[PDB]
Symmetry: D2
Subunit: 247 residues, 4 copies
């Protein structure tokens, strides 16, 4: 149908090897987008190419490196045309209580989870503004809004992306580009599967819905915001957390 | 497709004669819901029957009257089965600066815009919780979050709906019912069309997107939250305001 | 000192017999305000007269009754001059899960906890705006922002007060009146003392600070916003909740 | 009096040469704190020493340099005892629309306005936690919550400080340390005085109060949060913006 239809859009989804990123890439492709998913390695890029088949391709991208960003966008533009939808999903954790947090653990998070968003966003924005049409969707976290003990670096970066998003949104709204954040709660992924029973139960105790989210549920929220129908949503943070936090 | 598919769901959409409510009713029907839309008058109800055709019907409902609510829900359950999706869209304005605001202008807004949501939500919840599946979606306003001079009553009611929504979300999350608000900005409606050019311009000046929203844009957000895919979103307020306010 | 000095200000503090309201009345008096505190009963009012002594007096006030409001304001203006600081502290609870919540439990909370704020704020605003100086401070609750199962009525009312507060703040900012909310978390009161040990423990478990708040801690926040020094704070909600919720 | 009394507290106020930082340092000293204010140069440190007289001293601090931080805290501890109140006020701007924003302009803001807060906070926290008493107050900006075109870097850093603050707050609340942000709106300073008439009027048009804030008004909010009386406020953002934004 013509509802939530992404045919004709080119989507770049960072960190698309697995979990939330993979679910995003698959759904955008299902809705008709030509999808380029990225991983930090060629092997990862190949796995992305395999799941996407005729609907797109995988590319190796170093999200903390200017040169890689330039080569990847050049290749996408040449084959597919300009990126219409950027989904900033690639992110890392370096957890520690503040008194144990290393300088490097702070700077690695800032680099990968915040400065990367500045870099990629800037790199795709010029084409979006010329077209007067574009979507930038950041995959954040409930932690950016709620805070979390042991993750002050992660929280800082995720919260920073929201402040960046609102400012970008104000800059580019009148030119038909929207900029938004989707903030997942506790989603079932390799990382959550690696927690023990006591930790899972303690985390679930804070979720009114009483279960972990599915990566597809994050995908659906991203797909919604990517759509033509979401053109009047900008500078927003869409929380998908089963009631863990309510703003 | 199976995507954002409401076949098998019965939707009650209050205040569905025109504008946002009509757009909601039409889009839910398009996505496969059986839709009952309401109006104050039997002729309004017939106009709703006429635009829905085989996909539902119109009923007269007074959202401030317990007996009317009871009769309408009875008729819906009898013919369609119990309500699966409630959209609380019926609302009024009684604008005035506080020093000119009459007691009845306050109380009428409380009754129509806040108490009605209590009454209708309570009336549909029992069925939804037995089924362990449901959706309650309130159509709010940016005014509830932002405040607006000359609309302290409307703002209070709309903000109250959010408090109600968060509490109810907490109450019924573990039983598969989500409760959310869609908060429109300045949407093109009869009321906005009746503003003079200086008033329209002044309001557009506060919208980074530089245009009014379309009722279908509000409908799209409501259809998204009504969907199976939105099961992990609860206690949330989805802002659709062209960047007029950024939370 | 000249710091946080309320000499020359007349303060009306509703529901000042005990707990938070009493703490507010006492601290405003300590900072030099002439304070009128209210209770429902004449014996309550006399207890307020007794603790305030030369720094003010107690009056019986029914915050849901227009005639009572008019009589009390008349008596205050006659003896003290017009109200400069209104503290809307009087509130009740009528807890129940929504399916057990009676119509009167809903309406009584709306009347006492939200409509009263409209009525009293309107009744004092004219004087404040003629003077181009005033303070309206609502005593809210973390429940208004967080939601709470079993308190959808209380949450709605408290959230409504915030919408009202933002709108009124917008209306009267340029005329030197500020309008704000103080939102307490779990504060030690008679009601909290009547909880059993399992209930107290469970609530403390949601407070990072690991204790209940003291009524004087709420009083301090109210005195701060009442001060000349807080003239640039308006439309704000000051959370005092030991980290129970972080906005 | 014993109200808002900081006698016995040692306060470190970064960027205290002028404006908001100077106003903070002066008021904390007025309320009885021993105050160390910092500047980036010895000349600045001397001017701080001059205004503080017997109530404290000025010190040169490079907020983006570990070694400077260590020497300054050592000197303070030796003479005054451990820092009880840290006010992170030092911050810079490197404004530009995103398409013109240089890599260096991003990284300079991240360094000075966000990473510095991580560094200084960590450096003072151990002593505060041993004492089970402490205040960390970040001077943020309305821009961190609202966003602002031309300041996506500044907004990102300021928003990041809030996410850091909430996480720190959750980490250290049970040990009597509070961590909060004060978010100024448009405050009269050298920078605002350097704007032309058209820019000032355009900015003032967005402030309901209809004037710029005074640095002393920011100081008062900081002093309040620094006080013993604010012990039950943590993880909070206190907005002082004349209604420019209302959360």
């Amino acid at each position: 149908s013509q509802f939530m239809n992404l045919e004709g859009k080119v989507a770049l989804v960072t960190g698309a090897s697995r979990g939330i990123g993979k679910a995003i890439a698959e759904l955008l492709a299902e809705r008709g987008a030509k999808v380029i998913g990225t991983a930090t390695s060629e092997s990862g890029a190949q796995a992305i190419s395999d799941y996407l088949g005729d609907n797109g391709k995988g590319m190796a991208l170093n999200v903390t490196n200017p040169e890689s960003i330039e080569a990847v966008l050049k290749a996408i533009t040449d084959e597919f045309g300009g990126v219409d939808i950027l989904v900033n999903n690639a992110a890392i954790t370096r957890d520690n209580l503040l008194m144990r947090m290393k300088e490097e653990e702070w700077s690695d998070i800032m680099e990968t989870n915040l400065t990367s968003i500045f870099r990629l966003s800037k790199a795709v924005l010029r084409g979006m503004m010329k077209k007067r049409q574009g979507r930038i969707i950041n995959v954040g976290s409930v932690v950016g809004t709620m805070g979390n003990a042991g993750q002050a670096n992660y929280a800082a970066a995720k919260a920073g992306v929201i402040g960046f998003t609102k400012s970008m949104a104000r800059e580019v709204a009148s030119r038909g580009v929207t900029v938004n954040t989707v903030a997942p709660g506790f989603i079932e992924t390799d990382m959550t599967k690696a927690l023990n029973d006591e930790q899972r139960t303690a985390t679930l105790a804070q979720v009114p819905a009483g279960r972990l989210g599915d990566p597809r549920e994050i995908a659906s929220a991203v797909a919604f915001l990517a759509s033509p129908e979401a053109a009047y949503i900008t500078g927003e943070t869409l929380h998908v957390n089963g009631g863990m936090y309510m703003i």
